[PDB]
Coordinates of C-alpha atoms and ligand atoms in Angstrom, one line a residue:
Chain H
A53 CA -11.8 -52.4 -12.9
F54 CA -8.6 -51.9 -14.9
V55 CA -5.9 -52.8 -12.4
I56 CA -2.9 -50.5 -12.7
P57 CA 0.2 -52.8 -12.2
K58 CA 1.1 -52.1 -8.6
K59 CA 4.5 -51.2 -7.4
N60 CA 6.7 -53.8 -5.7
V61 CA 8.7 -53.2 -2.5
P62 CA 10.6 -49.9 -3.2
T63 CA 13.6 -51.0 -5.3
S64 CA 15.8 -48.2 -4.0
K65 CA 15.2 -49.5 -0.5
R66 CA 17.6 -47.0 1.2
Chain R
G259 CA -2.0 -36.8 -13.6
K260 CA 1.0 -36.4 -15.9
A261 CA 3.8 -38.9 -16.6
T262 CA 5.7 -40.4 -19.5
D263 CA 4.1 -43.8 -18.8
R264 CA 0.4 -44.3 -18.8
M265 CA 0.4 -46.3 -15.6
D266 CA 2.3 -43.7 -13.7
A267 CA -0.2 -41.0 -14.9
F268 CA -3.1 -43.1 -13.8
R269 CA -1.6 -43.6 -10.3
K270 CA -0.7 -40.0 -9.8
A271 CA -4.1 -38.7 -10.8
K272 CA -6.0 -41.3 -8.8
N273 CA -4.0 -40.8 -5.6
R274 CA -4.1 -37.0 -5.9
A275 CA -7.9 -36.8 -6.4
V276 CA -8.8 -38.2 -3.0
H277 CA -6.9 -35.2 -1.4
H278 CA -9.1 -32.7 -3.4
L279 CA -12.6 -34.0 -2.5
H280 CA -15.8 -31.9 -2.7
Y281 CA -19.0 -32.6 -0.8
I282 CA -22.1 -32.3 -3.0
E283 CA -25.4 -31.6 -1.4
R284 CA -28.0 -34.1 -2.8
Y285 CA -31.7 -33.5 -2.5
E286 CA -33.2 -36.7 -1.0
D287 CA -29.9 -38.4 -1.9
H288 CA -30.9 -38.7 -5.6
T289 CA -30.9 -35.2 -7.3
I290 CA -29.9 -31.6 -7.0
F291 CA -31.7 -29.1 -4.9
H292 CA -32.4 -26.7 -7.7
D293 CA -31.7 -26.0 -11.4
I294 CA -28.1 -24.8 -11.9
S295 CA -27.0 -22.7 -14.9
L296 CA -23.3 -21.8 -15.1
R297 CA -20.6 -20.9 -17.5
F298 CA -17.0 -22.0 -16.7
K299 CA -14.8 -20.1 -19.2
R300 CA -16.5 -21.0 -22.6
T301 CA -18.3 -24.1 -21.4
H302 CA -22.0 -23.7 -20.5
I303 CA -23.8 -26.2 -18.3
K304 CA -27.5 -26.1 -17.6
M305 CA -28.7 -28.7 -15.1
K306 CA -32.3 -29.3 -14.1
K307 CA -33.7 -31.0 -11.0
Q308 CA -35.7 -34.1 -11.9
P309 CA -38.1 -36.5 -10.1
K310 CA -37.2 -40.0 -9.1
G311 CA -37.0 -42.5 -12.0
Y312 CA -36.0 -39.8 -14.6
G313 CA -32.4 -41.2 -14.8
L314 CA -29.3 -39.5 -15.9
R315 CA -30.0 -37.7 -19.2
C316 CA -26.7 -35.8 -19.6
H317 CA -23.3 -35.8 -21.2
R318 CA -21.6 -39.2 -20.8
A319 CA -18.8 -37.6 -18.7
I320 CA -21.4 -36.0 -16.4
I321 CA -23.1 -39.4 -16.1
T322 CA -19.8 -40.9 -14.9
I323 CA -19.3 -38.1 -12.4
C324 CA -22.9 -38.2 -11.2
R325 CA -22.6 -42.0 -10.4
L326 CA -19.5 -41.2 -8.4
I327 CA -21.3 -38.4 -6.5
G328 CA -24.5 -40.4 -6.0
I329 CA -26.9 -38.3 -8.1
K330 CA -29.5 -40.7 -9.7
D331 CA -31.9 -38.3 -11.6
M332 CA -30.8 -35.2 -13.5
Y333 CA -30.9 -33.5 -16.9
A334 CA -28.0 -31.4 -18.2
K335 CA -27.2 -29.7 -21.5
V336 CA -23.6 -28.7 -22.3
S337 CA -23.2 -25.9 -24.7
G338 CA -20.2 -23.8 -26.0
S339 CA -16.9 -25.6 -25.8
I340 CA -17.0 -29.3 -24.9
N341 CA -13.6 -29.2 -23.3
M342 CA -13.4 -32.1 -20.8
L343 CA -11.4 -30.1 -18.2
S344 CA -13.7 -27.1 -18.4
Chain N
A2 CA -8.1 -38.1 3.7
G3 CA -8.9 -34.3 3.9
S4 CA -9.6 -31.8 1.3
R5 CA -6.8 -29.4 0.1
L6 CA -9.3 -27.2 -1.7
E7 CA -8.6 -24.1 0.4
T8 CA -10.6 -21.8 -1.9
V9 CA -13.9 -23.8 -1.5
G10 CA -15.6 -23.0 1.8
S11 CA -13.5 -23.0 4.9
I12 CA -11.5 -25.5 6.9
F13 CA -14.6 -26.0 9.1
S14 CA -17.2 -26.6 6.4
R15 CA -14.8 -28.9 4.6
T16 CA -14.0 -30.9 7.7
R17 CA -17.7 -31.0 8.9
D18 CA -18.9 -32.3 5.5
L19 CA -16.1 -34.9 5.2
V20 CA -16.6 -36.2 8.7
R21 CA -20.4 -36.1 7.9
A22 CA -19.8 -38.1 4.7
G23 CA -17.7 -40.7 6.4
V24 CA -14.5 -39.9 4.6
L25 CA -12.7 -38.6 7.8
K26 CA -12.9 -41.4 10.4
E27 CA -12.0 -39.2 13.3
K28 CA -12.7 -35.5 13.8
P29 CA -9.5 -33.4 14.2
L30 CA -8.4 -32.2 17.6
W31 CA -9.4 -28.6 16.8
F32 CA -12.9 -29.3 15.4
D33 CA -14.8 -29.5 18.8
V34 CA -13.2 -26.2 19.9
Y35 CA -14.1 -24.4 16.7
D36 CA -17.7 -25.7 16.9
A37 CA -18.0 -24.4 20.5
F38 CA -16.2 -21.1 20.1
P39 CA -16.4 -20.2 16.3
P40 CA -14.7 -17.1 14.9
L41 CA -16.8 -14.0 14.1
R42 CA -16.2 -14.5 10.4
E43 CA -16.0 -18.0 8.7
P44 CA -12.6 -18.0 7.0
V45 CA -13.6 -18.2 3.4
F46 CA -11.2 -17.2 0.6
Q47 CA -12.2 -14.0 -1.2
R48 CA -10.5 -12.4 -4.2
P49 CA -9.4 -8.7 -3.7
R50 CA -10.8 -6.5 -6.5
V51 CA -9.7 -3.0 -7.4
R52 CA -12.4 -0.3 -7.1
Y53 CA -13.6 1.2 -10.4
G54 CA -15.8 4.1 -11.2
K55 CA -17.4 5.8 -8.2
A56 CA -16.6 3.0 -5.6
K57 CA -14.7 4.5 -2.7
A58 CA -13.4 3.1 0.6
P59 CA -15.7 4.0 3.5
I60 CA -12.8 4.9 5.8
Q61 CA -13.3 8.4 7.2
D62 CA -10.7 11.0 8.2
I63 CA -10.5 11.4 12.0
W64 CA -11.0 15.0 12.9
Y65 CA -11.9 16.9 16.1
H66 CA -13.2 20.3 16.9
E67 CA -9.9 21.3 18.5
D68 CA -8.0 20.5 15.3
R69 CA -9.2 23.9 14.0
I70 CA -7.5 25.5 17.1
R71 CA -4.4 23.3 16.8
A72 CA -4.0 24.3 13.1
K73 CA -4.2 28.0 13.9
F74 CA -1.9 27.8 16.8
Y75 CA 0.8 26.0 14.8
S76 CA 0.4 28.5 12.0
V77 CA 0.7 31.5 14.3
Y78 CA 3.3 30.2 16.7
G79 CA 4.6 26.9 15.3
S80 CA 5.9 23.9 17.2
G81 CA 7.6 25.3 20.3
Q82 CA 11.1 24.4 21.3
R83 CA 9.5 22.1 23.9
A84 CA 9.9 18.6 22.4
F85 CA 7.0 16.1 22.4
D86 CA 7.4 13.2 24.7
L87 CA 5.2 10.5 23.2
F88 CA 6.3 7.8 25.6
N89 CA 4.5 9.6 28.5
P90 CA 0.7 8.8 28.0
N91 CA -0.3 12.1 29.8
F92 CA 2.1 14.5 28.1
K93 CA 0.5 17.9 27.5
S94 CA 2.2 20.0 24.8
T95 CA 2.1 23.7 24.7
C96 CA -0.5 23.4 21.9
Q97 CA -2.7 21.2 24.0
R98 CA -2.4 23.7 26.9
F99 CA -3.5 26.4 24.5
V100 CA -6.4 24.3 23.3
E101 CA -7.5 23.6 26.9
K102 CA -7.4 27.3 27.9
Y103 CA -9.0 28.4 24.6
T104 CA -11.8 25.9 25.3
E105 CA -12.3 27.3 28.8
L106 CA -12.6 30.9 27.6
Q107 CA -15.2 29.7 25.1
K108 CA -17.4 28.6 27.9
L109 CA -17.5 32.1 29.2
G110 CA -19.5 33.3 26.2
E111 CA -17.1 34.7 23.7
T112 CA -18.4 34.0 20.2
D113 CA -15.6 35.4 18.0
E114 CA -12.4 33.6 17.1
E115 CA -10.1 36.6 16.7
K116 CA -10.7 38.1 20.1
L117 CA -11.0 34.7 21.8
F118 CA -7.7 33.6 20.2
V119 CA -5.9 36.8 21.3
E120 CA -7.2 36.5 24.8
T121 CA -5.9 32.9 25.1
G122 CA -2.4 33.9 24.3
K123 CA -2.4 36.6 27.0
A124 CA -3.5 34.1 29.7
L125 CA -0.6 31.9 28.9
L126 CA 1.9 34.8 29.0
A127 CA 0.6 35.6 32.5
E128 CA 1.2 32.0 33.5
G129 CA 4.8 32.1 32.3
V130 CA 4.5 30.3 29.0
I131 CA 6.9 31.4 26.2
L132 CA 5.0 32.2 23.0
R133 CA 7.4 33.4 20.3
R134 CA 5.4 34.2 17.2
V135 CA 6.8 33.3 13.8
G136 CA 7.1 37.0 13.1
Chain E
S46 CA -24.1 9.0 23.5
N47 CA -20.3 9.7 23.5
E48 CA -18.7 13.1 22.8
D49 CA -15.3 11.8 21.8
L50 CA -16.2 10.4 18.4
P51 CA -14.6 12.0 15.3
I52 CA -16.5 14.7 13.6
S53 CA -16.7 15.4 9.8
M54 CA -14.6 18.4 8.7
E55 CA -12.3 19.5 5.9
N56 CA -8.6 19.0 6.7
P57 CA -7.9 22.0 8.9
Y58 CA -4.1 21.5 8.5
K59 CA -4.3 21.7 4.7
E60 CA -1.7 24.0 3.4
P61 CA -2.5 26.7 0.8
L62 CA -2.0 25.7 -2.8
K63 CA 1.4 26.7 -4.2
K64 CA 1.5 29.6 -6.6
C65 CA 3.9 30.3 -9.4
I66 CA 6.1 33.3 -9.2
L67 CA 3.9 35.0 -11.8
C68 CA 0.5 34.2 -10.3
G69 CA -1.7 37.2 -10.5
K70 CA 0.6 39.4 -12.6
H71 CA 0.1 40.7 -16.2
Chain P
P133 CA 27.2 -43.6 8.9
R134 CA 26.2 -41.4 11.9
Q135 CA 22.4 -41.3 12.0
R136 CA 20.1 -38.8 13.7
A137 CA 17.9 -40.1 16.4
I138 CA 14.1 -40.1 16.4
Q139 CA 12.9 -36.5 16.6
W140 CA 9.5 -37.2 18.2
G141 CA 8.1 -39.4 20.8
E142 CA 5.1 -41.8 20.9
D143 CA 2.6 -38.9 21.4
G144 CA 4.1 -37.3 18.2
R145 CA 5.3 -34.1 19.8
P146 CA 8.8 -33.3 18.4
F147 CA 11.6 -32.9 21.0
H148 CA 13.0 -29.6 19.7
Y149 CA 11.2 -26.2 19.5
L150 CA 12.9 -25.6 16.1
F151 CA 11.9 -29.0 14.7
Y152 CA 9.5 -27.8 12.0
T153 CA 12.3 -25.7 10.4
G154 CA 13.9 -28.9 9.2
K155 CA 17.3 -27.7 10.4
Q156 CA 16.8 -27.7 14.1
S157 CA 20.5 -28.3 14.8
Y158 CA 21.7 -25.6 12.4
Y159 CA 19.1 -23.1 13.4
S160 CA 19.5 -23.9 17.1
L161 CA 23.2 -23.1 16.7
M162 CA 22.3 -20.0 14.7
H163 CA 20.0 -18.9 17.6
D164 CA 22.6 -19.6 20.2
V165 CA 25.3 -17.5 18.5
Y166 CA 22.8 -14.6 18.0
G167 CA 21.9 -14.7 21.6
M168 CA 25.6 -14.6 22.7
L169 CA 26.1 -11.5 20.5
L170 CA 23.1 -9.8 22.0
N171 CA 24.5 -10.4 25.6
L172 CA 28.0 -9.4 24.6
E173 CA 26.7 -6.2 23.0
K174 CA 24.7 -5.4 26.2
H175 CA 27.8 -6.1 28.3
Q176 CA 30.1 -3.9 26.2
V194 CA 44.9 -17.6 14.0
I195 CA 47.5 -18.8 11.5
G196 CA 47.3 -22.3 12.8
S197 CA 43.5 -22.4 13.1
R198 CA 41.2 -22.8 10.1
Chain T
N76 CA -17.2 4.5 33.8
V77 CA -14.9 2.7 31.5
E78 CA -12.9 4.8 29.0
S79 CA -13.9 4.1 25.5
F80 CA -11.4 3.6 22.7
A81 CA -12.5 6.8 21.0
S82 CA -11.8 8.7 24.3
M83 CA -8.3 7.2 24.4
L84 CA -7.6 8.2 20.8
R85 CA -8.8 11.8 21.2
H86 CA -6.6 12.4 24.2
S87 CA -3.6 10.3 23.1
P88 CA -0.5 12.5 22.8
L89 CA 0.0 11.4 19.2
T90 CA -3.4 12.7 18.2
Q91 CA -2.8 16.1 19.8
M92 CA 0.5 16.3 17.9
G93 CA -1.4 16.5 14.7
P94 CA 0.8 16.7 11.6
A95 CA 4.3 15.2 12.2
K96 CA 6.3 17.4 9.8
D97 CA 8.9 19.5 11.6
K98 CA 7.8 18.4 15.1
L99 CA 10.6 18.1 17.7
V100 CA 10.3 14.8 19.6
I101 CA 12.4 12.8 22.1
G102 CA 13.5 9.4 21.0
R103 CA 15.5 6.6 22.6
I104 CA 18.4 4.7 21.0
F105 CA 17.4 1.0 21.3
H106 CA 19.7 -0.6 18.7
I107 CA 23.1 0.5 17.2
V108 CA 24.8 -1.0 14.2
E109 CA 28.2 0.4 13.2
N110 CA 27.3 4.1 13.0
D111 CA 23.6 3.6 12.3
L112 CA 21.4 4.5 15.3
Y113 CA 17.9 3.0 15.5
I114 CA 15.8 5.4 17.5
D115 CA 12.3 4.9 18.9
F116 CA 10.2 8.0 19.5
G117 CA 6.8 6.5 20.2
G118 CA 5.5 6.0 16.7
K119 CA 4.6 2.8 14.7
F120 CA 8.1 2.6 13.2
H121 CA 11.6 3.6 14.4
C122 CA 13.9 6.0 12.6
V123 CA 17.6 5.3 11.6
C124 CA 20.1 8.2 12.0
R125 CA 23.8 8.2 11.5
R126 CA 26.0 8.7 14.5
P127 CA 26.8 12.4 14.8
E128 CA 30.5 13.1 14.3
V129 CA 30.7 15.8 17.0
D130 CA 29.9 13.5 19.9
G131 CA 29.5 10.0 18.6
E132 CA 30.8 8.4 21.8
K133 CA 27.9 9.8 23.8
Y134 CA 25.2 8.1 21.6
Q135 CA 24.8 4.7 23.2
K136 CA 21.9 2.2 23.6
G137 CA 19.3 3.8 25.8
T138 CA 20.5 7.4 25.3
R139 CA 17.6 9.9 24.9
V140 CA 18.0 12.2 21.9
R141 CA 16.2 15.1 20.3
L142 CA 14.7 14.5 16.8
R143 CA 12.9 16.6 14.2
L144 CA 10.2 14.4 12.6
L145 CA 9.7 14.6 8.9
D146 CA 7.4 11.6 8.3
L147 CA 6.0 8.9 10.5
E148 CA 6.2 6.3 7.7
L149 CA 8.2 6.5 4.5
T150 CA 5.8 5.3 1.8
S151 CA 5.3 6.0 -1.9
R152 CA 3.6 4.5 -5.0
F153 CA 5.7 4.1 -8.1
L154 CA 4.7 3.6 -11.7
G155 CA 2.5 0.5 -12.2
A156 CA 2.1 -0.4 -8.5
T157 CA -1.2 -1.3 -7.0
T158 CA -0.1 -0.3 -3.5
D159 CA 2.5 1.9 -1.8
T160 CA 6.1 0.7 -1.3
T161 CA 6.8 1.1 2.4
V162 CA 10.3 1.3 3.9
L163 CA 8.9 0.4 7.4
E164 CA 10.8 3.2 9.0
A165 CA 10.1 6.8 9.9
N166 CA 12.0 9.8 8.6
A167 CA 13.7 12.1 11.2
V168 CA 16.7 14.4 11.7
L169 CA 18.8 13.7 14.8
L170 CA 19.3 17.1 16.4
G171 CA 21.2 16.2 19.5
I172 CA 21.1 14.6 23.0
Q173 CA 18.3 15.4 25.5
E174 CA 19.7 16.8 28.8
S175 CA 17.5 17.4 31.8
Chain J
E53 CA -16.5 -47.9 30.2
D54 CA -14.0 -45.6 31.8
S55 CA -12.8 -43.8 28.6
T56 CA -16.2 -42.0 28.1
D57 CA -16.3 -40.7 31.6
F58 CA -12.7 -39.6 31.4
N59 CA -13.4 -37.8 28.1
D60 CA -16.5 -36.1 29.5
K61 CA -14.9 -34.9 32.7
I62 CA -11.7 -33.7 31.0
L63 CA -12.1 -33.1 27.2
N64 CA -15.8 -32.1 27.0
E65 CA -16.1 -30.2 30.3
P66 CA -14.0 -27.1 29.4
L67 CA -16.1 -26.7 26.1
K68 CA -19.2 -25.9 28.2
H69 CA -17.9 -22.6 29.6
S70 CA -17.5 -19.3 27.8
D71 CA -14.1 -18.4 29.3
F72 CA -12.8 -21.6 31.0
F73 CA -9.3 -20.3 31.1
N74 CA -10.2 -16.7 32.2
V75 CA -8.2 -15.2 29.3
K76 CA -10.3 -12.0 29.5
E77 CA -8.2 -10.8 32.5
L78 CA -5.0 -11.0 30.5
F79 CA -5.6 -7.8 28.6
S80 CA -7.8 -4.7 28.4
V81 CA -8.4 -2.0 25.8
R82 CA -6.2 0.3 27.8
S83 CA -3.3 -2.1 27.8
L84 CA -3.7 -2.7 24.1
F85 CA -3.7 1.1 23.5
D86 CA -0.6 1.6 25.6
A87 CA 1.2 -1.0 23.4
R88 CA 0.3 1.0 20.2
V89 CA -1.8 -1.9 18.9
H90 CA -4.1 0.6 17.2
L91 CA -1.4 2.1 14.9
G92 CA -1.8 0.9 11.3
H93 CA 0.0 1.6 8.1
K94 CA -0.6 4.6 5.9
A95 CA -3.9 4.7 4.0
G96 CA -2.1 4.0 0.7
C97 CA -1.0 0.6 2.0
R98 CA -4.5 -0.4 3.1
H99 CA -5.8 -3.8 2.1
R100 CA -9.4 -3.8 1.0
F101 CA -10.3 -6.7 3.3
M102 CA -9.0 -4.8 6.4
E103 CA -11.5 -1.9 6.0
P104 CA -14.1 -3.4 8.4
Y105 CA -11.5 -3.3 11.2
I106 CA -10.2 0.2 10.6
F107 CA -11.6 2.9 12.9
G108 CA -10.4 5.7 10.6
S109 CA -7.5 7.5 9.1
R110 CA -5.7 10.1 11.2
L111 CA -3.7 12.3 8.7
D112 CA -3.4 9.4 6.3
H113 CA -2.5 6.9 9.0
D114 CA -5.0 4.1 9.5
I115 CA -6.2 3.7 13.1
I116 CA -7.3 0.1 14.0
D117 CA -10.4 -0.1 16.1
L118 CA -9.4 -1.6 19.4
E119 CA -12.9 -2.4 20.4
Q120 CA -13.0 -5.0 17.6
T121 CA -9.4 -6.0 18.4
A122 CA -10.5 -6.8 22.0
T123 CA -13.3 -9.1 20.8
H124 CA -11.1 -10.7 18.2
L125 CA -8.3 -11.2 20.6
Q126 CA -10.6 -12.7 23.2
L127 CA -11.6 -15.4 20.7
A128 CA -8.1 -16.0 19.6
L129 CA -6.7 -16.4 23.1
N130 CA -9.6 -18.6 24.1
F131 CA -9.0 -20.9 21.1
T132 CA -5.3 -21.0 21.8
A133 CA -5.8 -22.0 25.4
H134 CA -8.3 -24.8 24.5
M135 CA -5.8 -26.2 22.0
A136 CA -2.9 -26.1 24.5
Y137 CA -5.2 -27.7 27.1
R138 CA -5.9 -30.5 24.6
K139 CA -2.2 -31.1 24.1
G140 CA -2.2 -29.6 20.6
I141 CA 1.1 -28.8 18.8
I142 CA 1.2 -25.0 18.5
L143 CA 3.6 -23.5 15.9
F144 CA 4.6 -19.8 15.9
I145 CA 5.4 -18.4 12.5
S146 CA 6.9 -15.0 11.7
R147 CA 9.3 -13.7 9.1
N148 CA 10.0 -10.3 10.8
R149 CA 13.7 -10.6 11.5
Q150 CA 13.6 -7.9 14.2
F151 CA 11.6 -10.3 16.4
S152 CA 12.9 -13.7 15.3
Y153 CA 15.0 -14.1 18.5
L154 CA 12.1 -13.0 20.8
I155 CA 9.6 -15.4 19.1
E156 CA 12.0 -18.3 19.2
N157 CA 12.5 -17.9 22.9
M158 CA 8.8 -17.5 23.7
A159 CA 8.1 -20.8 22.0
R160 CA 10.8 -22.6 23.9
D161 CA 9.6 -21.2 27.2
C162 CA 6.0 -22.3 26.8
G163 CA 7.0 -25.7 25.4
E164 CA 5.8 -25.0 21.9
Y165 CA 7.4 -24.6 18.5
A166 CA 8.6 -21.7 16.4
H167 CA 9.4 -21.3 12.7
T168 CA 10.9 -17.8 12.1
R169 CA 13.2 -18.8 9.2
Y170 CA 12.8 -19.0 5.5
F171 CA 9.8 -21.2 4.9
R172 CA 10.9 -24.0 2.5
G173 CA 8.4 -25.1 -0.2
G174 CA 6.3 -28.1 1.0
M175 CA 7.0 -27.9 4.8
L176 CA 3.3 -28.5 5.5
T177 CA 1.8 -30.1 2.3
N178 CA 4.8 -32.4 1.7
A179 CA 5.7 -33.1 5.3
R180 CA 5.6 -36.9 5.2
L181 CA 8.4 -36.8 2.6
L182 CA 10.4 -34.0 4.3
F183 CA 10.1 -35.2 7.9
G184 CA 8.9 -38.8 7.7
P185 CA 5.8 -40.9 7.2
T186 CA 4.8 -40.8 10.9
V187 CA 5.4 -37.1 11.4
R188 CA 2.6 -35.2 13.3
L189 CA 1.8 -31.8 11.9
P190 CA 0.9 -28.8 14.1
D191 CA -2.7 -28.6 15.4
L192 CA -2.6 -24.8 15.6
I193 CA -0.4 -22.2 13.8
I194 CA -0.1 -18.7 15.3
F195 CA 1.1 -16.0 12.8
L196 CA 2.6 -13.1 14.7
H197 CA 3.3 -11.6 11.3
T198 CA 1.3 -12.8 8.4
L199 CA 3.3 -11.1 5.6
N200 CA 6.7 -12.3 4.3
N201 CA 9.6 -10.0 3.6
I202 CA 8.2 -8.9 0.2
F203 CA 5.0 -7.6 1.8
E204 CA 2.9 -10.6 0.5
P205 CA 1.0 -13.2 2.6
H206 CA 3.2 -15.8 4.2
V207 CA 3.0 -19.0 2.1
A208 CA 2.1 -21.0 5.3
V209 CA -1.3 -19.2 5.5
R210 CA -2.4 -20.8 2.3
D211 CA -0.7 -24.1 3.1
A212 CA -2.3 -24.2 6.6
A213 CA -5.7 -23.9 5.0
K214 CA -4.8 -26.7 2.5
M215 CA -3.9 -28.9 5.4
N216 CA -7.0 -27.9 7.4
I217 CA -5.0 -26.4 10.3
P218 CA -6.6 -23.5 12.1
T219 CA -4.6 -20.3 12.1
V220 CA -4.4 -17.4 14.6
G221 CA -2.9 -14.2 13.1
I222 CA -2.1 -10.6 13.9
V223 CA -3.4 -8.8 10.8
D224 CA -2.2 -5.2 10.2
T225 CA -4.0 -2.8 7.9
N226 CA -2.0 -4.0 4.9
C227 CA -2.6 -7.7 5.5
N228 CA -5.1 -10.1 3.9
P229 CA -7.2 -11.8 6.7
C230 CA -9.5 -13.9 4.4
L231 CA -7.9 -17.3 5.2
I232 CA -6.9 -16.7 8.8
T233 CA -9.3 -18.5 11.0
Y234 CA -9.0 -16.2 14.1
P235 CA -7.7 -12.9 12.8
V236 CA -6.7 -10.3 15.4
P237 CA -6.5 -6.8 13.9
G238 CA -3.5 -5.0 15.4
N239 CA -0.1 -3.4 14.9
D240 CA 2.5 -5.9 14.0
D241 CA 5.5 -3.6 13.8
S242 CA 6.0 -1.8 17.1
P243 CA 8.1 -3.8 19.6
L244 CA 5.7 -2.9 22.4
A245 CA 2.8 -4.4 20.4
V246 CA 4.8 -7.6 19.5
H247 CA 6.0 -7.9 23.0
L248 CA 2.4 -7.8 24.3
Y249 CA 1.2 -10.5 21.8
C250 CA 4.1 -12.8 22.9
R251 CA 3.3 -12.3 26.6
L252 CA -0.4 -12.9 26.0
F253 CA -0.1 -16.1 24.0
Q254 CA 2.7 -17.4 26.2
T255 CA 0.6 -16.9 29.3
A256 CA -2.6 -18.5 27.8
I257 CA -0.6 -21.5 26.7
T258 CA 1.1 -21.9 30.1
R259 CA -2.1 -21.4 32.0
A260 CA -3.9 -24.0 29.9
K261 CA -1.2 -26.7 30.2
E262 CA -1.2 -26.2 34.0
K263 CA -5.0 -26.4 34.1
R264 CA -4.9 -29.7 32.2
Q265 CA -2.5 -31.1 34.8
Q266 CA -4.6 -29.9 37.7
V267 CA -7.8 -31.3 36.2
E268 CA -6.2 -34.7 35.4
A269 CA -4.7 -35.0 38.9
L270 CA -8.0 -34.3 40.6
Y271 CA -9.7 -36.9 38.4
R272 CA -7.1 -39.5 39.2
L273 CA -7.0 -38.9 43.0
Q274 CA -10.8 -39.1 43.1
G275 CA -10.7 -42.2 40.8
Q276 CA -8.7 -44.3 43.3
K277 CA -10.9 -43.4 46.3
Ligands
LIG1 S1 -0.3 29.4 -10.2 FE1 0.4 30.3 -12.1 S2 -1.1 31.8 -12.6 FE2 -1.6 31.1 -10.5
LIG2 MG1 2.6 -3.8 9.9

């Protein structure tokens, strides 16, 4: 399965 | 799913689809209960109920969707416009 | 998960099928109540269409026999100065009093409207009702 | 059955059709 | 910065009857002033900005 | 011996009133805004009448007044509309104050 | 071992009775008639889907059939009580500004929730972003008025169905009841009618919550001894 590069810990991180 | 980046488009479409799920009634968990003839806009789809072992003899896109639904045996002929969304 | 396809089936059929398919791990709090005490109509989305050709709405006009008497009374006499009190559930207008009396004189055996109508007015005048004709 | 159900009539309160000032005159 | 407290408990029931508006404080105040006006109606500067 | 809905409808005071045009009815002022008086007379919708100049002071919330009804609900269909536009209020003329 | 017994005696027991909360005694056809529940809009305002519920037109004024209203209201009040008994979040929605104050008080009095204000886009379908990831949505939504202030269906009716939330609704003769789970055909304009609906739904909710406390207490007292 083509793995969509997953998001890291939310950068904004309010 | 729509986005400037292809990865964002994939994610948006994938995550939104699971919130818009249909339930498809499968006869004996391998085919459709009866032959379905339908026209959606200008696309015509004629599906036929088939016995076990027939396989999926339909448009490649329908084959993909049928595997996701769990239909193993079916025939379908698509006429008119071959628009993928229709 | 849940299905946001509100135009396909109802909230019940969608929930029943998804719980049945194993997508919804737990039935929602309302499901068991609906299953026990379902509504008279399954709430399925329908599209309102305009009526073309000879299609007409089946709603009928509500009429009663005494409307014929009421119409003539209002034409001959008109709405009396006495004001309708619609808050009182048992309010009897001068017209209704006329209808009631007229209906009683019909039981006697009078078969003509003109005479029967005239006789009704006289009875009310004897009782003290004020009947000022439009003329 | 019941006697209080609505019956089928023609609007008894219907007003006569309006006539122009010359209706019926040569 | 002053931060609003949790608006629902463990059970998940919000604590305010106007929670689902999204402006419970504003609309609660709006409700209060309207109520006072109703009661007042039924009963009947330079320095301050 | 339970009264059916049809029985209630036939005998209801509103049914025996018949057409509402030029019918004198008694309403109650339930809301007042400036000089606008919102009067309930027993119909589906209330009517709004301006405070009479002769005796405005007398008209207060709860006062019973005499009206002449013109329409129970102001509705009309304008060019291109699929349904009527409703004002959600009755049309009436405030005649005066009811005195017993 | 104890959870199943608790659930059977408490959660499943009420579902075996036709009128567990005795909501039938709260109203009669006479009481509905005296509140002007049968008075509909003019025939020119009629919605096609409300025709099955209309008794007739009296001088171009649609009369709602109160015999069907009674059966529809019985089911709506029964469903509301069972949800309050099950500790469900009930949200009252109405955009009629004549009754916003009344409805907001009724919700606070019965320990429920009211939304009488402008319904902002996504309150239900985007709640986790608007309120928070752990926000719990309503279990029942009761529409005292199903139309917004431009005489079109309140957006929450569609969004409630998207979120699979059952809806109770007073549907006048100009309303669209197709997506309302428990429609109750009746007048939604007259104060007397709206005051009756509020009294009926507030009582059913209060009755159900007290019954839940009584049943739980009896189960607990018996459990110890
Ligand atoms: S209406 Fe003009 S001729 Fe009769
Ligand atoms: Mg209405």
